[PDB]
Amino acid sequence: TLQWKCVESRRDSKRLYYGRFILSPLMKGQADTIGIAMRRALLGEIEGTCITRAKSENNIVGIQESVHEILMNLNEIVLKSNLYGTRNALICVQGPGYITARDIILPPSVEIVDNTQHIATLTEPINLCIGLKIERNRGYSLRSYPIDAVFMPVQNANHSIHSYGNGNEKQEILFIEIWTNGSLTPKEALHEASRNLINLFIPFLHVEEE
Amino acid sequence: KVMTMDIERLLLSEDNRFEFVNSVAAEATEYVEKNRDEYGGTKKAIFHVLSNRVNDLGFDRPEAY
Amino acid sequence: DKKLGRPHPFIDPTKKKQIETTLTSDESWWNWRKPEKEQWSRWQRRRPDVETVFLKAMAETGQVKLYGKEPTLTETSLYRARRHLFKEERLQAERERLAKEGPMAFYSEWVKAWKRDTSREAVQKHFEETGEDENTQLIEMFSHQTDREYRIMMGTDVRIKRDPLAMRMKEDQIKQIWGGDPVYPTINYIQA
Amino acid sequence: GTRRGICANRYNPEPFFCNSYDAIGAYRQKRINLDSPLWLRWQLDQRVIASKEVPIEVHYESFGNYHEIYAHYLIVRSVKKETLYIYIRTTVGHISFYREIEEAIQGFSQACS
Amino acid sequence: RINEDEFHKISLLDCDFFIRKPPDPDNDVYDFREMYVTPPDTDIYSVPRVLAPMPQKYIRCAMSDYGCYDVTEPPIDAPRDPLYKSEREISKVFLTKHYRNRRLNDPEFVLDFEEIYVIDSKTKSITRARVLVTVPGGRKRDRKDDLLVIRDNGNSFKIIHVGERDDPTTVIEREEWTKTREDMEKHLRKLRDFSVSNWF
């Protein structure tokens, strides 16, 4: 019967989680269809969360980074949340010192993935609040600088197929590999992708009232 | 997969490629003379010689990788 | 010209260019004389190109202007170098027309059987009674689309991105790609 | 890679990616196409390729930051502080060509561990 | 001849300039009278070709290099010689006056783009940049928003408002376009019909 197992798991960085999952046995041709659909779902049907805008209402004086470099380091902030719509987070730091993802005040459903992520270095005693628009969006979807973060909880996914047992049924085995961004574990990403696929295909089974 | 890099390492180690390959053939035929276990299935005497020699180079490869 | 020869289309040589008068026949060696009758040549007739039909269709739509009524080989070579710019400009104007008109009015181009008013105002005024939102109206409109119309509409598929002009060139224009009907009639080749 | 100049704009008058995996992700999500120009932060700011060409332009801010713009890359550097970053103007194709060779070297040398 | 213990060794590609300096904690100040030029390490000196009026008083300047990169890309011998080399080639240097000779840490620190001195490696020469100002206000304008553009191999200088700054993308695009337009005309001109054709 069709069963799946987590064959490998790794945590080579706080913002790179890897997993590999076996599904077996599969009928001739099913493994590639599953892998293709699952890969599309992982790589863009998963809803992901990231910073989508930053306001710095005060090149700003006394910050070492250029403002563009601040925004580009903010893009690297990895978030996990179940937000509906947009929400506001807020950096507030008085210098001198490092501003880091730990210093984000988070809206209720959000949590930081790597609190050690850099943001800015204040070289002198100055005020730097930053007002951050956060959103949860599908990867494929879509004083106020847009950060254009690409809602990409899965950095990569792949699949491969192997025949097994030398049996003349020629049934086969699927290996799915996932590099989640740490905002999700690989097993959670696999579940989310599967469920989102089922949510895409159920509509064809919708009956409507008379 | 990786075993040919070990081969290249040993080719880089020895001062004559032909003398190296002669020494490998000698080591294999003396192995298959000093030991008479059949040792001919999924693992082969040539790969064993290469493995033992790269282990002498200190590298963590198992017998016939 | 001197200004606005950057950006927009302009005559490659500046206007007021000089012209010259040269050796007439009987001033010239026999090998450098134009013959007293124009000689027949297989090459006498301008080759029909895709780039000529497209550049004429762009000229008549006013997207471009040309030095004469027929696109020169220089102009068609430049079109060959630049056509994707005009194609993406037309596709962008098509996206913008979609955004303005809404899907009912846009896609009704390929539903001749849909006689009702498709403007956004009429779609709203129909939603305000029939309860059918814009989507149910669009599903109904497409439910009146015939298979052949749908296959023609499939040029607007977001992956195909067929040129809005190539979708709308008429037969007597497309004919000029190969240069009209073959002189030897194809009925000689047709076999059941 | 890119269409150049007259082949790219109808008249005379690009995203930034903080690393190449962000660019590949945006390509996979169809935010950008293989041919399309983009800027990659070349934080490995050694090994910049050049054609022996002087800066096509430089901008100096009054506060002494300046940007050098070239036909292939940009460098932000200041008279105080230091060079911040090179940004290389490139394509998903060029990025993939470089990355898959670097990752082939890494994949081979993985056994060196 | 002259010692270097109190000279800025402004190393260009083809030579080093020696510029006398007074003592300052930031090593930030230039004499602009005791000028010398030296082949890259030859320890021989001569007065460089001063081509412009130069300030006979100690003033403080930022310095920057107009160098190209070059990929030396040398041939590689057997001992894993590196399959690339790339090196900075400082064809030219800019020395930019500080406004009021303000120190780098002063709150009102501004570069005085009105006073740029240009050092050329290959003509072994010094010049004063004839910058053009596009900004409304002449000498009494707010200098914090000034942005200097340098162009034409560092022969052209233009002070422009900070907001105006063309994007790097549209700069590169405009240079590519103005190149390819002339290349395409130079190609199309060989056709007979070019005389009766439109840019389209």
Automatic annotation (TrEMBL), chain A:
GO MF assignments: DNA binding; DNA-directed RNA polymerase activity; protein dimerization activity
Chief location: plastid
Residue spans crossing the bilayer = none
The catalysed reaction is: RNA(n) + a ribonucleoside 5'-triphosphate = RNA(n+1) + diphosphate
Q: Where does the DNA-directed RNA polymerase RpoA/D/Rpb3-type domain start and stop, copy by copy?
A: 18-207
Keywords linked to the UniProt accession: Chloroplast, DNA-directed RNA polymerase, Nucleotidyltransferase, Plastid, Transcription, Transferase
Q: According to the UniProt record, where is the region Alpha N-terminal domain (alpha-NTD)?
A: 1-208
Q: State the compartments where it is located.
A: Plastid, Chloroplast
**Gene Ontology cellular-component annotations:** chloroplast; DNA-directed RNA polymerase complex
Give the E.C. number(s): 2.7.7.6
Q: Does the keyword DNA-binding apply?
A: no
- Give the GO biological process terms: DNA-templated transcription
Cite the domain annotation text: The N-terminal domain is essential for RNAP assembly and basal transcription, whereas the C-terminal domain is involved in interaction with transcriptional regulators and with upstream promoter elements.
Subunit notes for this chain? Answer: In plastids the minimal PEP RNA polymerase catalytic core is composed of four subunits: alpha, beta, beta', and beta''. When a (nuclear-encoded) sigma factor is associated with the core the holoenzyme is formed, which can initiate transcription.
| Role according to the record | DNA-dependent RNA polymerase catalyzes the transcription of DNA into RNA using the four ribonucleoside triphosphates as substrates.
The record's similarity note reads: Belongs to the RNA polymerase alpha chain family.
Task: Write down what this protein is called.
Answer: DNA-directed RNA polymerase subunit alpha
Tell which residues of the whole protein are contained here: 12 to 235 of 327
TrEMBL record, chain D:
Q: Which domain of life is it from?
A: Eukaryota
Compartment(s) where it occurs, according to its Swiss-Prot or TrEMBL record = Plastid, Chloroplast
Q: How does it assemble?
A: In plastids the minimal PEP RNA polymerase catalytic core is composed of four subunits: alpha, beta, beta', and beta''. When a (nuclear-encoded) sigma factor is associated with the core the holoenzyme is formed, which can initiate transcription.
Q: Which family does it belong to?
A: Belongs to the RNA polymerase beta' chain family. RpoC1 subfamily.
Describe its function.
DNA-dependent RNA polymerase catalyzes the transcription of DNA into RNA using the four ribonucleoside triphosphates as substrates.
Question: What protein name applies here?
Answer: DNA-directed RNA polymerase subunit beta'
**What organism is the protein native to?**
Sinapis alba (White mustard)
Range of the intact protein held here? 545 to 677 of 680
